[PDB]
């Protein structure tokens, strides 16, 4: 009933897939039953034909059903993710924002890869900071228990994605597959701060999150950043109670001086490492501001699990707690505790 | 300057390529420097972004410039081709191939380009091969076939060996792309006229565009029933290409007295079955198959007339129908096929 020619032909006719087809196509790829030419066609055609939440949801689902889980009852019910799609065109604001959030006591489980794969970045910079990025399910859990944060290395948790990843490296261009990182976190946290460079596709990511009933803020800086920016306003899709809701967000309302795009910027892994140490050590400046802002974001999303949570006080509490996790040195200390953890195994 | 991410990114942005990019891409493909994923992505991306005449011409041109030519001065200025894209999803009898033989028998030089089937049960080359005709001849001997029989057959895999890299890849995706247009645009003998079949109603105008740029006299045809031939079951759309301009027409056989046929009457089988249908028609069997053969054959004869400006549409069709029918009725077509087989076995 399903088949590659059927599905590819339907995509090249500019038609949404029937429900199930996207899933079948991803399952073919996962099971190794997909020629690298079919993977490539699907990936491009799914992109040029504007992909829908259901379709993206089916891809992420199938991927997740082949992924290694974390052991039962080790992921707190209120964990969050802090991550972006990448393809921005930075300093690793997410990485820092994630450390600050965990430091404030919100459990964080992150998903990522090394740069230029379809499943997000940040592992390089984490590796340059001394953190062990590729641990199995059991140790990611133990890290989340002992440290307050764990990192799920995509190759480790999605070994069947191998093929799709190789193919996508060669076409060397953004596709619908670049949305899968935030959506295929093996630990399935119910909250998060999710950045997206591709503005059209943010609302699609948001809808996938709505269907999971997650409490998530998908964020797009109106300067094109895959984070909440301080260059200008941002667009936020507030995902709550299964509903999506598009908003405009201006950090001026909380006293954030406008910064230039090129101050939140210019980062290879060894440099990004140094920016983290600078900033976690108290270096004031536009990078700190944007880390503080995005961390508050994740903490607001965490508050949104409560369902009695109000938007503006949630942001103040968020800004307050992230500021304090930095200024107390709890964040710097958490990073250190994270590195030590990785050495004591 | 140019790269796969540059070119693939532009296409995915739903943007027309810059001049030279399509050519660079096709040239990477032809020389073996393109990865399978790059090829598939390009072909699919180029299809979903409506491709332009310039783009398809650059693909076709790179291909031609890598193909094996026929020798100097062996192709008449007025040679015609009779060939389609294939991929109509109907396994009809081989209309183009039967048309080609009739046309050569009317005294119009035919240099046909061809291939085995990709989806149907028997392609032109398959059916020709089943008849005793040699499909695998090289350039020199294709030239000699044309001189001695009046017809030559250029087997695409033989003249376009560097297409091998794109062939396997495109087969694997199993869906038609812009690449499915190249066969009829890459006849290595570069004849200036033809009747060119297109299975895809939405890409047929682009093919006409490519032919218009070369200043060929060509009718690009699509049956409104989906045939990559002139049909007899209904009307056909014709992009007439002449003096560098394209001109869209609708064509109705009823006007030249043709009864409406049913698609299943034009249906065919494997290479042996399709070879028996050619023998039946060239033998004088009246009926719908013959009807469609005569019709297309006139079609090509009209494209041939169109090499000369001041040829008029109606009298050229009428003259075309007389000559196609006569070619069959006098035994001339049936004899040329025999001479053609004889020629193969005598080298
Ligand atoms: O496999 P398909 O996609 O169905 O295509 C069937 C055939 O039609 C095309 O050529 P040609 O113009 O010689 O067609 P003919 O069979 O009508 O002679 C193509 O080269 C195939 O041989
Ligand atoms: Mg990020
Ligand atoms: Mg970023
Ligand atoms: Mg044909
Ligand atoms: Mg046909």
Report on the structure:
- The structure is a homodimer.
- With 345 residues, chain A is of the alpha/beta class.
- Chain A folds into two domains: 1-67, Transferase, Pyrimidine Nucleoside Phosphorylase, Chain C (Transferase, Pyrimidine Nucleoside Phosphorylase, Chain A, domain 3, Up-down Bundle); 76-345, 3-Layer(aba) Sandwich (Pyrimidine Nucleoside Phosphorylase, Chain A, domain 2), CATH 3.40.1030.
- The first copy, chain A, contains 15 helices and seven strands.
- Chain A has helices spanning 4-12, 21-30, 36-48, 53-66, 93-103, 123-128, 137-146, 154-157, 162-171, 180-183, 199-211, 269-280, 286-303, 311-327, 330-343, and strands at residues 80-84, 108-112, 149-153, 191-195, 215-221, 234-239, 246-249.
- Chain A has a five-stranded mixed beta sheet, with helices on both faces.
- In chain A, α11 (199-211) links the parallel β4 (191-195) and β5.
- In chain A, α4 (53-66) crosses α11.
- The termini of chain A are far apart.
- At the A-B interface, α1, α3 and α9 of A face α1, α3 and α9 of B.
- One magnesium ion binds at residues 84, 95-96, 197, 228-229 of chain B.
- Chain A: One of its GO terms (biological process) is L-tryptophan biosynthetic process.
- Chain A: Mg(2+) 2 binds at residues 226-227.
- Chain A: It is an enzyme of class 2 (transferase).
């Amino acid at each position: 009933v399903p088949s590659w020619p059927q599905i590819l032909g339907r995509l090249t006719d500019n038609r949404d897939l029937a429900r199930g087809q996207a899933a079948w196509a991803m399952d073919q790829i996962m099971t190794g039953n997909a020629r690298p030419a079919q993977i490539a066609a699907f990936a491009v055609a799914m992109t040029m034909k504007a992909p829908t939440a259901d379709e993206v949801g089916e891809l992420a689902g199938v991927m997740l059903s082949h992924a290694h889980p974390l052991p039962a009852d080790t992921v707190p019910d209120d964990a969050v993710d802090v991550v972006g799609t990448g393809g921005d065109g930075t300093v690793n604001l997410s990485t820092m924002a994630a450390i600050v959030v965990a430091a404030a006591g919100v459990p964080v489980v992150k998903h990522g890869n090394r740069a230029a794969s379809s499943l997000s970045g940040g592992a390089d910079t984490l590796e340059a900071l001394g953190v062990r990025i590729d641990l199995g399910p059991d140790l990611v859990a133990r890290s989340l228990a002992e440290v307050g944060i764990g990192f799920c290395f995509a190759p480790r948790f999605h070994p069947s994605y191998r093929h799709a990843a190789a193919v996508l490296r060669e076409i060397g261009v953004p596709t619908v597959f670049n949305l899968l990182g935030p959506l295929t976190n093996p630990a399935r946290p119910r909250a998060g701060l999710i950045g997206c460079a591709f503005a059209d596709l943010a609302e699609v990511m948001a809808g996938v999150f709505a269907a999971r009933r997650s409490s998530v803020l998908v964020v797009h800086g109106d300067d094109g950043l895959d984070e909440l920016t301080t260059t200008t306003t941002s667009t936020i899709w507030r995902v709550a109670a299964g509903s999506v809701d598009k908003l405009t967000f201006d950090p001026a309302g909380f006293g954030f001086a406008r910064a230039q795009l090129d101050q939140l910027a210019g980062g290879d892994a060894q440099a990004n490492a140094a920016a983290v140490r600078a900033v976690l050590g108290g270096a004031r400046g536009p990078v700190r501001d944007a880390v503080v802002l995005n961390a508050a974001g994740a903490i607001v999303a965490h508050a949104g699990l409560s369902s009695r949570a109000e938007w503006l006080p949630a942001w103040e509490e968020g800004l307050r707690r992230a500021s304090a996790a930095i200024d107390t040195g709890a964040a710097e200390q958490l990073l250190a505790r994270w590195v030590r953890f990785g050495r004591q195994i």
